[model samples]
Target: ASGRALFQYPMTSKIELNGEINGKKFKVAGEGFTPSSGRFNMHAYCTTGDLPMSWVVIASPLFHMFAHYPEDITHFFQECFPGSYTLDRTLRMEGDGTLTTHHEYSLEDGCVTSKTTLNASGFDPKGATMTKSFVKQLPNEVKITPHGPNGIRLTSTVLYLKEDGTIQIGTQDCIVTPVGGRKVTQPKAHFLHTQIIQKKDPNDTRDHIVQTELAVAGNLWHGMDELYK
Candidate 1:
């Protein structure tokens, strides 16, 4: 039998859009997919910045409520994997930073045989730390199960950094965690990940009526510019 590697098949897709926002008409593009490891990955970059900001502003409040503590996705880092040190450094970056990472996992004999993650990040000021973490999850047979009626349980060996600053192996931090992300899980383990910001319709049907008029006006301008050119 042939071996199955990460991304043996590409699970990516893209979309182009034409939409109106705040009386301005715009065209945009986006993409989405599930990673080969069954994790979600999404990228939605566009020519005009407004719509993206609209989408992101709506998504921001959720991050503050969910990421660290009580949620327990720490194995994503604390685990003694082949690429642990690389991720450790990325997570330890100082203020005002961004990072991008690609993680690969392969199946062997119907089990998780190996895993690797390539990580990189930069800081605003000079002389900042640069890192690459490459770690493997030991015993490679992680299992996920339902703990109670409303909880999920995971059993896997993970790595930890001790007070002395050395990696500790064969130790585990078991948690009866929630199903939501940092926003929803950290505070109360509630399913609500964010607060929806909504404003009442100022006038009866004002949105549809205004949006249509503005979009038509924009399209007409673009059409006229193209004709003149």
Candidate 2:
């Protein structure tokens, strides 16, 4: 809560990643942040459950992102759902080979939305390979809301369309820590959906809404370097 509030919860973000996995080459294009960090390179991994719904789960800078913590956070969740989908936790050869684990859950309707921190610490931009894993379902619920500061809020909504012409829509929100920061105040309209995705296609859209606020009474929680001076 000290750092950037969960100003933005995890949702479905599209990316074009085409490559190989487990010695087999393939092309993949889907959602995730694509963080240029750790060994878990991909933004978020997805999977489906036996209950007829798919899920996508990802790690957020919420409590610990770059910071070192028990990777079991994700492992525990993945174990819950197995076989339906594969968890891809491949990034750079960072750390002592600690596989980063984000959170993943079945969607409301069984859709999927997931995110995992990439271990970019040892990633070789040249031609390196890594392994990642994910859990999945087939319902149609792909939505996540990250909590930011105290009063600050963050939320996201998504509607997944199936080949049969059916649709799955989900809405989620989050609030930051601390509550009232100096710069931004309570009941503030921090998110500008119109400005962020006005010209963008509506059918394919991405945005974050915060509900809670942080106690940014003075300067940002972390100290800024001489860049300010």
The TM-scores of all predictions, comma-separated, are: 0.21, 0.24
Error of 1 at 14 (Å): 1.5
Worst 10 residues of 2 by lDDT: 209-218
Write the residue-wise lDDT of candidate 1 on 1-229 in tens digits: 2211222333443334443322344444433343333332333333565331223211111011111112223223212222211111122222323322222222322222212222223333331221112121122222333333433333333332233454433322123433223212111112111112223235532211101000000121223223221
Model 2 alpha-carbon miss at residue 122, Å: 41
lDDT (C-alpha, whole model) for all candidates? 0.26, 0.25
Candidate 2 residue spans exceeding 4 A from truth: 1-53, 56-149, 178-187, 192-229
TM-score of 1: 0.21
Query: Superposing all C-alpha atoms, what RMSD in Å does each candidate have to the true structure?
Result: 24.5, 19.2
C-alpha lDDT of candidate 2 relative to the true structure: 0.25
Give the lowest summed-lDDT range of ten residues in model 1.
Answer: 209-218
Clashes of each: 17, 91
Tell me the deviation in Å of residue 174 in model 1: 34
